Amino acid sequence: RQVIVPVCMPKIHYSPLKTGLCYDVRMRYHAKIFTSYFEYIDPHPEDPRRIYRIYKILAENGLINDPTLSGVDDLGDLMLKIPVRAATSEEILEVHTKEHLEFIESTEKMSREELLKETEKGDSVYFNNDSYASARLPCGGAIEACKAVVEGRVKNSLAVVRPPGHHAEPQAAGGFCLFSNVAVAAKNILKNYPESVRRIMILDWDIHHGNGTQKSFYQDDQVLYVSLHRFEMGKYYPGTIQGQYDQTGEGKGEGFNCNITWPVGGVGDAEYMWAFEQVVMPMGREFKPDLVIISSGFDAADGDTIGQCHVTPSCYGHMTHMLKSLARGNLCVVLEGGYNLDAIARSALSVAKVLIGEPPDELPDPLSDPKPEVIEMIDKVIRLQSKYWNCFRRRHANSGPINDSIISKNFPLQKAIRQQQQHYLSDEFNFVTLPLVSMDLPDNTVLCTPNISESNTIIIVVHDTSDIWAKRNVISGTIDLSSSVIIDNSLDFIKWGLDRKYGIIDVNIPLTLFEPDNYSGMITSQEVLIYLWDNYIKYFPSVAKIAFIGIGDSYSGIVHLLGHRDTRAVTKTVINFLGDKQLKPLVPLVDETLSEWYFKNSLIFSNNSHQCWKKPRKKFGRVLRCDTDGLNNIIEERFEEATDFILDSFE
Amino acid sequence: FEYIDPHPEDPRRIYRIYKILAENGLINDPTLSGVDDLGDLMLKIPVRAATSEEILEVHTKEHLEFIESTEKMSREELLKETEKGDSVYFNNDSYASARLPCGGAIEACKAVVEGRVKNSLAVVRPPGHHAEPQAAGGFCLFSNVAVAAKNILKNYPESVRRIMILDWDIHHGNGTQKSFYQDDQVLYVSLHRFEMGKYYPGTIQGQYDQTGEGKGEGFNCNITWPVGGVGDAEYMWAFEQVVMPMGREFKPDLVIISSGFDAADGDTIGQCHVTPSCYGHMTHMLKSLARGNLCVVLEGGYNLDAIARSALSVAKVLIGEPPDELPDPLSDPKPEVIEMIDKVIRLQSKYWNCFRRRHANSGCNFNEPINDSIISKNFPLQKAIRQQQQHYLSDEFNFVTLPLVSMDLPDNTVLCTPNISESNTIIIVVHDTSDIWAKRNVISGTIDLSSSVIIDNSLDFIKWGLDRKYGIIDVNIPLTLFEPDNYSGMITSQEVLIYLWDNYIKYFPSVAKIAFIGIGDSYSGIVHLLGHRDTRAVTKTVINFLGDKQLKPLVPLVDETLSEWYFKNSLIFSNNSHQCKKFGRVLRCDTDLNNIIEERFEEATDFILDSFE
Amino acid sequence: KRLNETQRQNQLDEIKNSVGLTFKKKQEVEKSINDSEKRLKHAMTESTKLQNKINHLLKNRQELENFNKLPSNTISSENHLEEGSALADKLKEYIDKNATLFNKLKELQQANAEKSKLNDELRSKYQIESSKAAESAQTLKILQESMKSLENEVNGPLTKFSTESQNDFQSLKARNKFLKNYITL
Ligand SMILES: [Zn+2]
Ligand SMILES: [Zn+2]
């Protein structure tokens, strides 16, 4: 009966409040002027149409209570309206110079044609007569959202705001921005609250580079600038060296700038998931910001013709979730880009639902296995940032030139593998080492099954020295040699063929040490192929249905044996596992129908990320593009289709 | 009268956690008695007794006969069954107290799946992560979670088909694992201290390679904390490295937690430092993982304040409030933790796809066990190196083998010049495997053979002493070989040194001036043998090319002038970026391992010749 | 019934806590009474030795007193009698305090001895009642079962007259792999 703990109010800070919203119909009139009929068939780079499309999609889901779709104060139960007011010239001059304010001031009082010449003259911008007040309202709305969040009037804010501000530079504008919205708001909050707001962490996923926002804080340590985009330095806007990944700050802001550049387009969900899983969270927790500002841009969405990416609106919710985990609950969202109104609508819808409090949904594809270029790109970023921050040292073996004279003293490792190879082969398969007399080569260049002169079906498998997978230790730098394996790749076929009573011939050709492309190997291959064909194959009486198997390179030997001889009468199929190598064009000399028999009786498996298809000829002989990479993977994968074509090719 | 120190499985655990929420406005029930009108953020669920059908789905009939029969046993019989259960206490009222957890569990889970609550919590005792289907064990009488989970799967074949069961209880979930060890539809994971017999339970089922069986392979997991004292660092680390990728790979319809805050900060049976903010942030990740489907079951926690604070944090995370801030984001987790997680992700790459081609594991497949036979395409490489050097030295200087009998090592581990028993001067090179410098491919892990730069630096002193007509003893201690998963190079080296010194070297007629060369980390075994035996009669000196390795602490077990004689007769070249009396004349070398070998060979060989005179 | 149940369960908790408390306090005063007994042993050796002084010096008094030629030894003797009496007074006060410590230990021990059996008895009768509690709960369970079966039946498509006759999703419409679980060709 004894009341021990008297009833009290819940002691929480996040969600008795609502989600802040800044919206205004007074920022949809900064528009371009008609120049040519080409404007009717182009995506209208920064259009005012972005606002009301998203704003329409909002009311359809009950989160805001507004069937009239116009500016009111009763925003419902889950969100709170934040009024916008024109930012005074003081907040604007916090980042910019004094000539750009007078530039936009003069711009207000111009005629039509001078504004046209300004639209034509600018670094991808456009001016208007209503471009002075409509440029002062974004920065003001941004400052109001940040004040609302910092002073705890809302749990977080979101701001539907245009024109952008992530391209405007302190010097002048360029990049469809007039006033830099992110930098102005960030410097005014650090100037207005330097006791609670002391470290700010700005992040950019917009597919252009936030060049102006970069320069604004390139020498700032309180502002951690992060930008994720595509570089493509030659063509892709902005095309500046500030967009390069090595811009890691300068002065006191060293290690407090980060550009993350995508070497190539086409990126999806797994890429951004993997990246946000690995890099941004340790440096963000180590940097410990008191406020995280978000420079949202949905110009790289699925269904966007400018970003050309396939990012789904679930990953956006996941990233919003992680950023909400990062900070203390204080979050602000300003919108920068977007071209396809439906994609930006669904993406902003998902982001706003996660911001009110809904959990992110599960991603439509958790399995993409990201492109190889971006991997080493982020490795180089990790090198720089490990030099600067500590959370990338001691865990990735970074910790912040071999020789050229000891090369005469080297452990051989080709003959050792081939010798050990020869050993375990002979001890289980009793292969006959075949001597290539009048030719200076290793004795174990070629090993054949015993009594080869009587087997009709003879499978000739040529391949280079085997693959090696090794383990590199993560504790300190270099690789661990004793913990390495020998990836014998040509083993399933030899065993396979011996289970079907075929003439099986193993051929190893070593690699030219310290050599990019094994050209001498290709020469030696043609020597072995032609010599073996002349001196040995034509002297065995019972021979029928030869099939060749090529692994990686050395297929020049087979190409030379086809073009420079006539041997298609007894062989019936050539097969190469090219993988990633360059194509070996057939040079036919005996006749031309040999080349079409070649092209016909052929199956070649080359990688997805190979040079082509990004369209080869028929002189390469009907190559095929795999879905996976690696020689081992594609051989274990298509081992059955290959034996099917072989058994189908024979009786 | 042990009531001073009561039982850690205690009734207050329910009541304490129930109290804490009512102190924070979450519960508006003042009298702390079970009512329905709790408040607005949560929703009370009734607890009922589990029927015999539910509880016999996993358990055997003899178990239920025993627990039903002991419900009206005499006092001394209860005493006998109490002392007979492996830390399980039985008493007069034991049938209903064990049949109510299972019922409450099925209640909370059915509430979650039918969409009547967003999620559920079940503050419950006795635990059920140690009860086996044929015998009780470890404070547990009936496996609650097994009963509950088998009810969910058999009674709901239209909306749920795969479930995740998590155990961050620091004791391994023994009973809950074997019930689904052959099962594939459920992915079980257990974060726990294992410590191989030391920690509770300390059985082979707790090992990190118990990955299921039959069709259940790759659908069972044990995370085995090697050392006690892990904190927020290793927990968040393992969560990001292993849990979340395979979690978004397996994609459950429901996530169930067999939680325990016996690993929370300030607990005594656990002795760990997991703060309740780490609990909240891991809970945040699991909330992110699924579409919202969650249920939590209480198993551990035997420190009322630790479990109570941890429960209050997790409850705030559950209502909708985001996680707070951790104590330290700059902590740099333990190396052994990273290696253990690496060995975990290795076999997980061997099974799952999400750990190869993003972790440089797509090169070789580990599903072939690494052999010299033709059964597996993989072949070890140190064997090839050793076979090549064996062939080389055998046709070259007629280097005979020394059979290291009664030890599990290859014949060509120790290579020696012929007639070593009559060598007036014996050089003993306790060497180590060579190193490379190349660029490992990041996508597959495979390397290149055309630019491979491997040098056999350990052959220079062999040919040098061979010209001196000195007996050469080459010993090859490799670095874990990647094959056995339990080979320990240091201890094996110490055994080989003890063994050879006591079986062969102490009997040789013309043994004199035995020198000792250790390259890299492979020199510490010499320190053991020197410290454990009086060998300085025949021993003249000892040489070490340490490279960048840490110094080896000499602790002598036979005299104290070993340290003096050692520090007088030792040259230990070290890294230039190393900077670090018993250490034995630390020399901070100039150039940089191969660098200091070809540079300080002359210093080494000359000091050898002067000490040898 | 659960009101009375939780009162008895908190009572049982407080009982076990109290048994811990009494055996704790007793276990701590054990070493105190042990040391007190050792000082008592020391004090008794002191009494014995002071009485040896008393005896030999009173012998010496008897030697000197008859037809006196009085030396100064008898005054020192009488002084040693005073020291022995004062030390006897001290050790007597001390053995009294010792006895106080010992009897408090003994009564605490007795309380601790009966407390366990009291706990066991409360446990026994607690089981006796909690049995009938559980079965009565099961009766109320089948009553709930009956009521929901009846109500569920009469609620839906119902009998021919209307005299009496979504959120939250009760009609198995929680959209997490339910419709997409069907074949739908
Ligand atoms: Zn943009
Ligand atoms: Zn446990």
Q: Tokens 């917009």 appear where?
A: A206
Residues on chain A touching B353 (C-beta within 8 angstroms): 367, 369
Give the Cα separation of C105 and C117 in Å (integer). 19
Contact assignment for B434 to A416 by CB distance below 8 Å: no
Gap between the Cα atoms of A211 and B480, Å rounded = 50
CB-based contact C20 B12, cutoff 8 Å: no
Selecting from A4, A482, A491 the residue whose C-beta is nearest the C-beta of B377 gives A491
Residue C93 CB-density burial (10 A; 0-12 exposed, 13-18 middle, 19+ buried): exposed
What residues contact residue A527 under an 8 Å CB cut-off, 6+ apart? A439, A557
CA distance B365 to B439: 20
Write the CB contacts of C110 (distance below 8 Å, at least 6 apart in sequence). Answer: none
- Please report residues of C whose CB lies closer than 8 A to that of B11: 9, 13
What is the CB-side half-sphere exposure of residue A495 using CA atoms within 13 A?
Answer: 13
Q: Give the whole-angstrom CA distance, residue B130 versus residue B174.
A: 5
Q: For B233, list phi and psi in degrees, rounded to 5.
A: -55, -60
Q: B1-351, what's its fold?
A: Arginase; Chain A (3.40.800)
Query: Are the beta carbons of C108 and C26 closer than 8 angstroms?
Result: yes
3-state secondary structure of C180: coil
Alpha carbon A496 to chain centroid distance?
A: 39
Euclidean distance between the first and final Cα of chain B, in Å? 76
Distance in angstroms (rounded) separating the CA atoms of residues B225 and B490: 22
Q: Pairing mode, if any, of strands B254-259 and B294-298?
A: parallel
- Measured between CB atoms, does A426 come within 8 Å of chain B? no
CA nearest to B367, candidates B354, B384, B351, B344: B351
Which residue type sits at A574? V
φ, ψ dihedrals at A44, nearest 5°: 55, 80
Are A415 and A443 contacting, i.e. CB atoms less than 8 angstroms apart?
no
Q: Which two tokens stand for residue A554?
A: 């050395």
State the Cα–Cα distance between residues A391 and A281, nearest whole angstrom: 10
The set of chains that have 3 or more CB pairs under 8 A with A is B
Whether the Cβ atoms of residue A203 and residue A213 lie closer than 8 Å to each other: no
Which residue in chain B has the smallest CA separation from A389?
A: B330
Rg over alpha carbons for chain C, rounded to the nearest Å, is 42
Q: For helices B561-568 and B524-532, give the axis angle rounded to 10 degrees.
A: 140
Secondary structure element (H or E) that encloses residue B167, with its range: strand B163-167
Shortest CA gap B110–chain C (Å): 12
DSSP 8-state secondary structure symbol assigned to residue A264: S
Quick check: bond before A238 cis, omega within 30?
A: yes
What the block records as the tokens of B99 is 């049949």
Residue A18 Cα, gap to closest chain B Cα (Å): 13
Token readout for B485 is 């998963």
Of the candidates A134, A130, A136, A119, the one whose C-alpha atom is nearest the C-alpha of residue A174 is: A119
Contact in structure between A200 and A149 (CB atoms under 8 Å): no
State the SS3 of A493-530: HHHHHHCCCCEEEEEEECCCCCCCCCHHHHHHHHHHHH
Q: Which helix (H) or strand (E) holds A377?
A: helix A372-388
Q: Which residues of B are catalytic?
A: 130
- Nearest CA among B136, B115, B135, B117 for reference residue B127: B136
> Nearest Cβ partner of B1 from C116, C174, C177?
C116
| Residues on chain A touching B594 (C-beta within 8 angstroms) | 403, 406
How far apart are the C-alpha atoms of A363 and A492, rounded to whole Å?
A: 38
Mutate to test the interface with B, among A468, A474, A491, A627 (most CBs of B within 10 A): A468
Strands A200-204 vs A223-230: parallel, antiparallel or unpaired: parallel
Across the interface, which of B32, B443, B449 has its CB nearest the CB of A375? B443
Cα B16 to Cα B124, B267, C74, distances in angstroms: 12, 16, 77
Q: At what angle do helices B96-113 and B144-155 cross, to 10 degrees?
A: 40
- Cβ–Cβ contact B12 with C under 8 A: yes
The arrangement of strands across the sheet holding B220-225 comes to B120-122, B294-298, B254-259, B163-167, B186-193, B220-225
Distance, in Å, from the CA atom of A159 to the CA atom of A535, rounded to the nearest integer, reads 81
Residue of B nearest to A275 (CA): B358
DSSP assignment of B237-248, as one string?
Answer: HHIIIIIHHHHH
Where does B417-540 have alpha helices with state H?
460-467, 489-503, 524-532
**Interatomic CA distance for residues B146 and B176, integer angstroms:** 6
Ranges of beta strands (E only) in A400-474 are 432-433, 446-448, 458-464, 467-472
Cα–Cα dist C93/A400, whole Å: 78
The Cα B116–Cα B483 span in angstroms is 52
> For residue A211, how many other CB atoms are within 10 A of its CB?
24
- Scanning the structure block, which residue is given the tokens 């979930």? B173
Query: Which of B72, B93, B107, B255 would you mutate first to test chain C, the one with the most C CBs within 10 A?
Result: B93
* Buried/exposed B251-273: b ≥16 CB within 10 Å, e otherwise: ebbbbbbbbbbbbbbbbebbebb
Strand partners, C64: none
Rounded CA separation B275/B313 (Å): 10
Task: Describe the crossing of helices B460-467 and B594-612 by its angle, rounded to 10 degrees.
Answer: 30
A19-388: CATH, from 3.40.800.20, 3.40.190.10, 3.40.50.1860, 3.40.50.300: 3.40.800.20
Contacting residues for A4 by C-beta, under 8 A, at least 6 apart: B30, B32
The C-alpha atoms of residue B336 and residue B342 are separated, in whole angstroms, by 10
If 0-12 CB within 10 Å is exposed, 13-18 middle and 19+ buried, where does residue B508 land?
A: middle
Nearest CA in chain B to A2: B31
Distance between CA B281 and CA B276 in Å, rounded?
9
Q: Does B158 touch chain C (CB under 8 A)?
A: yes
Rounded Cα distance between A517 and A524, Å, is 13
In the complex, which subunits touch B with 3 or more CB pairs below 8 angstroms?
A: A, C
| Minimum CA–CA partner of B117 in chain C | C168
Tokens of B121: 């919590």
Q: B186-193 and B163-167 as β-strands: parallel, antiparallel, unpaired?
A: parallel
Q: Are A132 and A147 in contact (CB under 8 A)?
A: no
Give chain A's largest Cα–Cα span.
108
- The answer to whether A481 contacts B321, with C-beta atoms less than 8 Å apart, is no
Q: Assign residue B481 a region: left if phi > 0, alpha if psi is -120 to 50, beta otherwise?
A: left
Kind and range of the H or E element at B428?
strand B426-431
Decide if A517 touches B, using CB distance below 8 A.
Answer: no
Instruction: Tell me if B3 and C23 make a contact (CB, 8 A cut-off).
Output: yes
Residues of chain C contacting residue B34, judged by C-beta atoms under 8 Å apart: 2, 6
For residue A341, the Cα-to-chain-centroid distance in whole angstroms is: 25
Beta partners for residue B517, in sequence order: B429, B543
Torsion of CA A94, A98, A100, A104, to 10 degrees: 100
Backbone torsion region of residue B274, taken as left when φ is above 0, otherwise alpha when ψ lies between -120 and 50, otherwise beta? beta
Residue A42 burial class via C-beta count within 10 angstroms: exposed 0-12, middle 13-18, buried 19 and up? exposed
Chain B 289-308, CB below 8 Å of chain C: which residues? Answer: 291, 293
Burial of residue A631 (CB within 10 Å: 0-12, 13-18, 19+) is buried
Q: Any CB–CB contact under 8 A between B290 and chain A?
A: yes
Asked whether the beta carbons of B324 and B283 are under 8 A apart, the reply is no
What CA–CA distance (Å, rounded) separates A243 from A377?
A: 14
Place of tokens 């016996």: B262
| Of B170, B120, B168, the residue nearest B148 (C-alpha) | B120
CB A184 within 8 A of CB A87: yes
Q: Which ligand is nearest to the CA of B192?
A: 2
Please give the distance of CA A103 from its chain centroid, rounded to a whole number.
40
Note whether C27 contacts B4, CB cutoff 8 Å: yes
From first CA to last CA, the distance across chain A in angstroms is 93
> Using the beta-carbon criterion (under 8 Å), do C16 and B49 form an inter-chain contact?
no
Q: A250 is written with which tokens? A: 């300068």
- Give the span between the Cα atoms of A47 and A72, in whole angstroms: 24
| B507 interfacial to chain C (CB closer than 8 Å) | no
Paired tokens of B540: 């003249």
Distance of CA B98 to the CA centre of its chain: 33
- In whole angstroms, what is the distance from residue B515 CA to residue B426 CA? 7
Contact predicate A226/A216, CB 8 Å: no
B456 contact A CB<8A: yes
Asked if C14 is an interface residue toward chain B (Cβ–Cβ < 8 A), one would say no
DSSP type of residue B425: S
Handedness of CA C145, C146, C147, C152 (dihedral sign): positive
Q: Which tokens sit at A375?
A: 């991997």
Q: Which residue matches tokens 């809970």?
A: B283
Residue of chain C with shortest Cα separation from B113: C174
Scanning A294-323 for CB atoms below 8 A from B yields 318, 321-322
B372 touches A: beta carbon within 8 Å = yes
Radius of gyration (Cα) for chain A, nearest Å?
Answer: 33
A195 touches chain B (CB under 8 A): no
CA–CA distance, B91 with B76 (Å, rounded to integer): 10
Separation between Cα atoms, residue B240 and residue B282, nearest integer Å: 9
Pick from A483, A487, A442, A510: nearest CA to B383: A483
Identify the helix (H) or strand (E) that includes residue B429: strand B426-431
- Rounded distance, CA A32 to CA A48, Å? 10
